[PDB]
């Protein structure tokens, strides 16, 4: 038999050394122990495509063409059981995502106690009936919208923002999970009442919990930071606001985060590539001097 | 005959449904501006700069970026160039991506398409979606092994 | 960066990880025997994430003892026994809060403060009425920002 994934396939690191620079190591996966071909299984990736890591009660994780393999408990680099004698209950589980239809799983967004997975037409929440996680780990399907595949399910509070694929001018989810019933998730529309103002391609969800928003940056227009200002009180939400923040013409804005409540801004001339720092404070001074906070641009 | 009326709060933001559909407050194009609650309708916050980073292609034509806080002393960017890695600093500086084992992972065409990045409190992963995980021949444990 | 207690066991927080200690004894990070795992053994948890989450805080708020840190919140508590090696982890509600502060409770809220750049606010954190387990946090300076430096 053989006992090791080839190292060069799989996904790769990127840890920093204490001078300073950051290294691009792949990682040891460890070797195939205590076991054969046919009772020591391959772990359903080794002949598709990984799409995604993710952790789950101390285990690693990766999706694949359909699967979801998680990894030992103590240990994330190890995707075998200890010995195929004696089934230990720390074993990696290999549960194909069951469905009706065709669905290769995309994300993996923890919401709200589940550590959901979704794919591309359906949505699928990973939690077991029972103990941790043994062989026994179910998988069921909750709500079948359709979510674009380019953009990373960004979680606010206790929603979940994701994009849609129309064909052109696009929309953006707003993913509950429900008052009334104990597991019952929803998806509404937050461009419900602003179609055809966000042009083809999400490609990065922002946010903030702090100044309370969600943007959206687009590669169909890309000089606009489509900008969702929201205000929950009392449960009940109390502005659904929109705006684009312009840096400028012929200016492309290629990439938004926050920590926070500075929105570090990397955007793009037709000459340089910056960096910028946009913060939320009310009177205080951005530079040192500056009587009066002059709004500015750059 | 001489109606008033106030619209009181414009919080607002772009609804582009028709005239006598909308709700007040809202408004058909919005620029720049920032809608907070009490404070009504501000000019955007003016964007501080930082320490450029390059010429026009010195990041990919639509590169992947994704930040990192560890710590509040310890922040990064990481950009994923068709062609390897850049990483800058979050005060505008750039630290040197070393390659020990070879690139040959991150080349890809469409890099924000293909590529992907999950940073966790000890260690970062990167997986590549178009690199399809081969199984290592040339490494069996014993060779041929008559079992008689 | 804590002390807790949680079902007769000490614990600490950690980089990402909570470790409790035994059963009986509070001073204590070892199992008995590494022969015959015994249901006592202390517990090594790393919280599982998608994203950068350093605990700071472990509050315990209605059934739970809920453990917070800086970017999302976590709740502690396990399917089964009451502490196994078997010990869920999950992260309800992902709102942000300040490292420095410790979150206080009165009722049935508890409060805590949020990081603005400068005139921060603080945050009501709730147990919903109408789910079994959904918590959230509103803005009790939703209506007056600009106070608190």
């Given at each position: 038999t053989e006992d090791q994934v080839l190292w060069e396939t799989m996904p790769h690191a990127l840890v920093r050394a204490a001078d300073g620079n950051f290294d691009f190591k792949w990682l040891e996966w460890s070797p195939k122990s205590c076991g054969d071909v046919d009772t020591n299984p391959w772990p359903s990736f080794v002949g598709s495509s990984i799409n995604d890591v993710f952790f789950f009660r101390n285990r690693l994780g990766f999706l694949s063409g359909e699967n979801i393999i998680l990894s030992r408990t103590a240990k994330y680099f190890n995707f075998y059981p200890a010995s195929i004698a004696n089934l230990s209950d720390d074993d990696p589980i290999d549960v194909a995502v069951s469905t009706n239809r065709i669905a290769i799983l995309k994300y993996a967004v923890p919401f709200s106690e589940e550590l959901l997975i979704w794919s591309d037409e359906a949505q699928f929440v990973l939690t077991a009936s029972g103990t941790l996680t043994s062989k026994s780990v179910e998988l069921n399907l909750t709500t079948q919208f359709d979510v674009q595949d380019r953009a990373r399910p960004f979680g606010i509070g206790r929603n979940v923002y994701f994009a849609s694929p129309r064909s052109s001018f696009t929309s953006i989810h707003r993913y509950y999970a429900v008052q009334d019933v104990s597991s019952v998730k929803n998806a509404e529309d937050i461009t419900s009442h602003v179609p055809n103002y966000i042009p083809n391609g999400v490609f990065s969800i922002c946010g903030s919990g702090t100044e309370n928003f969600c943007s959206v940056l687009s590669?169909?227009?890309?000089?606009?930071?489509?900008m969702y200002k929201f205000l929950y009180l009392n449960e009940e939400l109390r502005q659904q606001s929109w705006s684009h923040w312009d840096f400028?013409?012929?200016?492309?804005?290629?990439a938004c985060q926050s920590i926070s409540s500075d929105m570090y801004v990397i955007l793009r001339n037709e000459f340089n590539t910056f960096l910028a720092r946009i913060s939320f404070t009310?009177?205080?001074?951005?530079?040192?001097?500056?009587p009066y906070r002059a709004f500015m641009d750059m | 005959a001489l109606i008033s009326q106030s619209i009181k709060n414009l919080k607002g933001g772009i609804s582009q449904q028709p005239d006598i559909l909308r709700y007040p407050d809202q408004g058909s194009r919005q620029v720049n501006g920032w809608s907070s609650e009490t404070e009504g309708l501000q000019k955007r916050p003016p964007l501080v700069f930082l320490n450029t980073l390059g010429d026009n292609g010195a990041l990919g034509q639509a590169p992947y970026i994704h930040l990192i806080n560890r710590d509040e002393h310890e922040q990064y960017y990481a950009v994923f160039t068709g062609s390897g890695i850049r990483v800058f600093d979050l005060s505008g500086n750039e630290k040197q991506v070393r390659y020990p084992n070879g690139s040959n992972y991150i080349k890809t065409a469409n890099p924000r398409n293909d590529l992907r990045m999950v940073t966790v409190a000890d260690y970062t992963f990167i997986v590549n979606r178009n690199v399809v995980a081969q199984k290592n021949t040339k490494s069996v444990n014993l060779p041929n092994y008559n079992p008689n």
């Amino acid at each position: 038999t053989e006992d090791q994934v080839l190292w060069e396939t799989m996904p790769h690191a990127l840890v920093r050394a204490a001078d300073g620079n950051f290294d691009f190591k792949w990682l040891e996966w460890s070797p195939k122990s205590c076991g054969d071909v046919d009772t020591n299984p391959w772990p359903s990736f080794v002949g598709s495509s990984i799409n995604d890591v993710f952790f789950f009660r101390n285990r690693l994780g990766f999706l694949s063409g359909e699967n979801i393999i998680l990894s030992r408990t103590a240990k994330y680099f190890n995707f075998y059981p200890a010995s195929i004698a004696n089934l230990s209950d720390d074993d990696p589980i290999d549960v194909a995502v069951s469905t009706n239809r065709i669905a290769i799983l995309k994300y993996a967004v923890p919401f709200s106690e589940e550590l959901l997975i979704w794919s591309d037409e359906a949505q699928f929440v990973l939690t077991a009936s029972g103990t941790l996680t043994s062989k026994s780990v179910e998988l069921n399907l909750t709500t079948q919208f359709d979510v674009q595949d380019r953009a990373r399910p960004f979680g606010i509070g206790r929603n979940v923002y994701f994009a849609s694929p129309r064909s052109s001018f696009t929309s953006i989810h707003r993913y509950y999970a429900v008052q009334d019933v104990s597991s019952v998730k929803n998806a509404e529309d937050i461009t419900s009442h602003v179609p055809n103002y966000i042009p083809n391609g999400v490609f990065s969800i922002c946010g903030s919990g702090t100044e309370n928003f969600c943007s959206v940056l687009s590669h169909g227009d890309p000089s606009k930071i489509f900008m969702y200002k929201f205000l929950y009180l009392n449960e009940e939400l109390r502005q659904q606001s929109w705006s684009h923040w312009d840096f400028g013409e012929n200016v492309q804005v290629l990439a938004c985060q926050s920590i926070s409540s500075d929105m570090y801004v990397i955007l793009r001339n037709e000459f340089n590539t910056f960096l910028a720092r946009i913060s939320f404070t009310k009177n205080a001074i951005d530079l040192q001097g500056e009587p009066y906070r002059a709004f500015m641009d750059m | 005959a001489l109606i008033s009326q106030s619209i009181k709060n414009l919080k607002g933001g772009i609804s582009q449904q028709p005239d006598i559909l909308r709700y007040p407050d809202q408004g058909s194009r919005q620029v720049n501006g920032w809608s907070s609650e009490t404070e009504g309708l501000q000019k955007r916050p003016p964007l501080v700069f930082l320490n450029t980073l390059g010429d026009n292609g010195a990041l990919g034509q639509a590169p992947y970026i994704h930040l990192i806080n560890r710590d509040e002393h310890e922040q990064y960017y990481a950009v994923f160039t068709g062609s390897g890695i850049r990483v800058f600093d979050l005060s505008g500086n750039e630290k040197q991506v070393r390659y020990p084992n070879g690139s040959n992972y991150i080349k890809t065409a469409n890099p924000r398409n293909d590529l992907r990045m999950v940073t966790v409190a000890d260690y970062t992963f990167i997986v590549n979606r178009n690199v399809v995980a081969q199984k290592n021949t040339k490494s069996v444990n014993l060779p041929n092994y008559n079992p008689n």
